[PDB]
Design an enzyme around this catalytic site. Structure first.
Site, PDB file in Angstrom:
ATOM      1  N   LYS B   9       0.152  21.826 -17.441  1.00 17.89           N
ATOM      2  CA  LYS B   9       0.899  21.652 -16.199  1.00 17.89           C
ATOM      3  C   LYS B   9       1.108  22.933 -15.396  1.00 17.89           C
ATOM      4  O   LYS B   9       0.882  24.036 -15.898  1.00 17.89           O
ATOM      5  CB  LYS B   9       2.230  20.965 -16.518  1.00 17.89           C
ATOM      6  CG  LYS B   9       2.029  19.595 -17.173  1.00 17.89           C
ATOM      7  CD  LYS B   9       3.341  18.846 -17.400  1.00 17.89           C
ATOM      8  CE  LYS B   9       3.078  17.458 -17.979  1.00 17.89           C
ATOM      9  NZ  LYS B   9       4.326  16.650 -18.120  1.00 17.89           N
ATOM     10  N   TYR B  49       0.901   8.804 -12.068  1.00 17.88           N
ATOM     11  CA  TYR B  49       2.248   8.336 -12.391  1.00 17.88           C
ATOM     12  C   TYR B  49       2.602   6.994 -11.747  1.00 17.88           C
ATOM     13  O   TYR B  49       3.781   6.661 -11.621  1.00 17.88           O
ATOM     14  CB  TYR B  49       3.289   9.377 -11.963  1.00 17.88           C
ATOM     15  CG  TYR B  49       3.278  10.657 -12.771  1.00 17.88           C
ATOM     16  CD1 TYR B  49       3.478  10.636 -14.152  1.00 17.88           C
ATOM     17  CD2 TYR B  49       3.104  11.894 -12.150  1.00 17.88           C
ATOM     18  CE1 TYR B  49       3.509  11.819 -14.897  1.00 17.88           C
ATOM     19  CE2 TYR B  49       3.131  13.082 -12.883  1.00 17.88           C
ATOM     20  CZ  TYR B  49       3.336  13.036 -14.256  1.00 17.88           C
ATOM     21  OH  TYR B  49       3.383  14.207 -14.978  1.00 17.88           O
ATOM     22  N   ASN B 112       7.594  20.664 -19.146  1.00 22.75           N
ATOM     23  CA  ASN B 112       7.208  20.665 -20.545  1.00 22.75           C
ATOM     24  C   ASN B 112       5.794  21.147 -20.855  1.00 22.75           C
ATOM     25  O   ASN B 112       5.172  20.703 -21.819  1.00 22.75           O
ATOM     26  CB  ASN B 112       7.473  19.293 -21.178  1.00 22.75           C
ATOM     27  CG  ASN B 112       6.639  18.197 -20.570  1.00 22.75           C
ATOM     28  OD1 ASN B 112       6.012  18.382 -19.532  1.00 22.75           O
ATOM     29  ND2 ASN B 112       6.638  17.033 -21.214  1.00 22.75           N
ATOM     30  N   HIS B 115       0.347  17.989 -21.074  1.00 19.42           N
ATOM     31  CA  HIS B 115       0.213  16.543 -21.181  1.00 19.42           C
ATOM     32  C   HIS B 115      -1.050  16.254 -21.981  1.00 19.42           C
ATOM     33  O   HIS B 115      -2.039  16.979 -21.875  1.00 19.42           O
ATOM     34  CB  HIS B 115       0.056  15.885 -19.806  1.00 19.42           C
ATOM     35  CG  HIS B 115      -0.553  14.516 -19.874  1.00 19.42           C
ATOM     36  ND1 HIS B 115       0.156  13.403 -20.274  1.00 19.42           N
ATOM     37  CD2 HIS B 115      -1.830  14.100 -19.689  1.00 19.42           C
ATOM     38  CE1 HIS B 115      -0.657  12.362 -20.337  1.00 19.42           C
ATOM     39  NE2 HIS B 115      -1.867  12.759 -19.988  1.00 19.42           N
ATOM     40  N   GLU B 126      -7.636   8.430 -17.782  1.00 19.90           N
ATOM     41  CA  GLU B 126      -7.300   9.754 -17.269  1.00 19.90           C
ATOM     42  C   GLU B 126      -8.537  10.611 -17.022  1.00 19.90           C
ATOM     43  O   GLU B 126      -8.643  11.282 -15.996  1.00 19.90           O
ATOM     44  CB  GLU B 126      -6.325  10.445 -18.234  1.00 19.90           C
ATOM     45  CG  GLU B 126      -4.973   9.733 -18.294  1.00 19.90           C
ATOM     46  CD  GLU B 126      -4.040  10.268 -19.373  1.00 19.90           C
ATOM     47  OE1 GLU B 126      -2.922   9.725 -19.501  1.00 19.90           O
ATOM     48  OE2 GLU B 126      -4.415  11.218 -20.092  1.00 19.90           O
TER      49      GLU B 126
END
Lengths: 137, 137, 137, 137, 137, 137
Positions: B9, B49, B112, B115, B126
């Site tokens: 990220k 998302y 975080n 992913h 994905e």
């Protein structure tokens, strides 16, 4: 806004040295402006080593650089072209000093793990050749 | 054979953790099938998302995931999907155990660091969404 | 905002583990609010372990904690108290899991390398006991 | 006092993981009581895996353990047998947690990088089988 | 009993390089005789760079060194003053060799991550200035 | 098929530097052809330093090299003799450059952590002296 082109050769990739090498550039403080895993085609490789088209080692360079996927990238930072050449160490590992990438990870000139632009002009040429404009961030 | 999609990220890239994380996967023995620094488009983020497009935290997830460039990649190897999930650790860094990527590098849920595809099915989706087919090697 | 007190015990300092441990907290993202090499006075040690002044192992805890200099510090960040507790691992190295500070560096309970505040309340007390108020930045 | 037998399997040696693994044990605080690079003989391998001489996977275990040199060693220290077991992680890398040797370096059960005595009794037997008495220091 | 004074500048601290740097000195075998996180006041900084009070870059030095907390320390060991200067590398990162602290972590002279006493006399001066006697162990 | 002899001296072993050092040779790409922990006897040491039998420092060399177990090894690779001498750095740590083994881990000439053959001839001599033929793989 100086930038340079770096390529982790096929041997560097198969030996799993991509992360360790990138980490050295990140801890140094350089910015990754571009990055991608790619397979260099026969024609592309020959264009890259076009200046050596008449050299006797030309076929050898082309063969090794296309022997498997490589990781290409563009790094940005103060005097990054010369700084990266310093970080990689001498082209022939035997003359590369401990602490440099080739001095720490390589043993032969044929498989010297990495490549970095020699000058700003070579960098612009290499970036235009291996990356599409939209791949630069 | 089996493949999974991984994305470092914007916070992970910003903090210079790309090489360190990539190195963990290489040390583990997985193969890098694809890799690229990229800027997630508004469309890609929403597509990714979509499941939460109704949620109130949705606009937040999108702004963050597009706040800066990310490093997308495809890892290949025996049971790589479940293994990478284990390597990343709990989604919430508070539950992530030391030794884990989030356990060692993240402190909050919003940022975080990484992913990884939850399942084989999510992986196929994905990979097709983030990479052009010719970018898989 | 939230802060916790951490001390690398005399054995950890003696074995040259200060930087390695500190590095783990920095990689995690926590901020160093205070830091100093210090020799625990007999009074400070007794104050710290007052809870066990009656126990038969008390004289032992005191002699060890004052056997050499320690590195005291205050770490700041989201839920830092519970996170540091998790990062250090079980008090008894036998129960501490790999990836954990004690799991990776300690072998016995008497010399378990490090201490970290158990709760928010313990943190306030320990910080006030080990550091002068002006030493918190 | 207590001692355990550890062997970095042919795959671990082949992948250049000897130093990294050895370093983890040294950082932990254990003492190297014995160490040697060796080629497991057919007899030694059969003696070692005698328990499965009937199993159908036996011929496999033998071929692999003798597929290349291994690094045998004896580690000494407080509860070293159980500690090393914990440090290596689950036998099957799929169950091995990050932070663990197998969790960080292995991907399949056949090539799980390392072996460590299961019990005190197994340790005495293995040490006597792999090392000459004069090789223990 | 030779000793030297080292300061991890504000940039080194905010980039989270404190532990990594300390670790280099510990693995080298030097003893940490003093250590503390501190905020250099305007007056203190000016006294430190007193000799450059008339220089044109004086205001710049003072500003950067006070831009945030720094980590001050005293290291002891055989010829530690010259050895530490060697370990830090050239004052200007561009001329610092890979393997040295500035060669590995810095890119600009203004933010060159660390400072180390030039001579034993400078060391005594700097120690008397940044540390109270009781802070030396 | 060039090879060299390396010995991690007693000080290197007791400080727990065996794994870190081996790791440097493995990441470099050299092959470990032999390896073992051993205790050098008085007579063996004297034979090794036979040429210095008349030197005044002879007794000192013998004493230190026998003060505890050492780790002996044989490394193979392109120009490995000279490459290893380069990796170890100057015999006296004060003159060893950062990035080299002695430059990074040693502070005194008496305890300079490691030894490597000066020439191919010394290597053959040292290998014949410290290793039995069957210990070479």
């Amino acid at each position: 806004m100086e930038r340079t082109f770096v390529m982790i050769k096929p041997d560097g990739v198969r030996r799993g040295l991509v992360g360790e090498i990138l980490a050295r550039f990140e801890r140094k403080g350089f910015r990754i402006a571009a990055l991608k895993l790619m397979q260099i085609s026969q024609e592309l490789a020959e264009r890259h080593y076009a200046e050596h088209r008449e050299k006797p080692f030309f076929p050898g360079l082309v063969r090794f650089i296309t022997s498997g996927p490589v990781v290409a990238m563009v790094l940005e930072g103060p005097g990054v072209v010369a700084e990266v050449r310093k970080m990689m160490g001498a082209t022939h590992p035997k003359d590369a000093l401990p602490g440099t990438i080739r001095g720490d990870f390589a043993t032969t000139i044929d498989e010297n793990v990495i490549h970095g632009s020699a000058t700003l002009e070579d960098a612009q040429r290499e970036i235009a050749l291996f990356f599409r404009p939209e791949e630069l961030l």
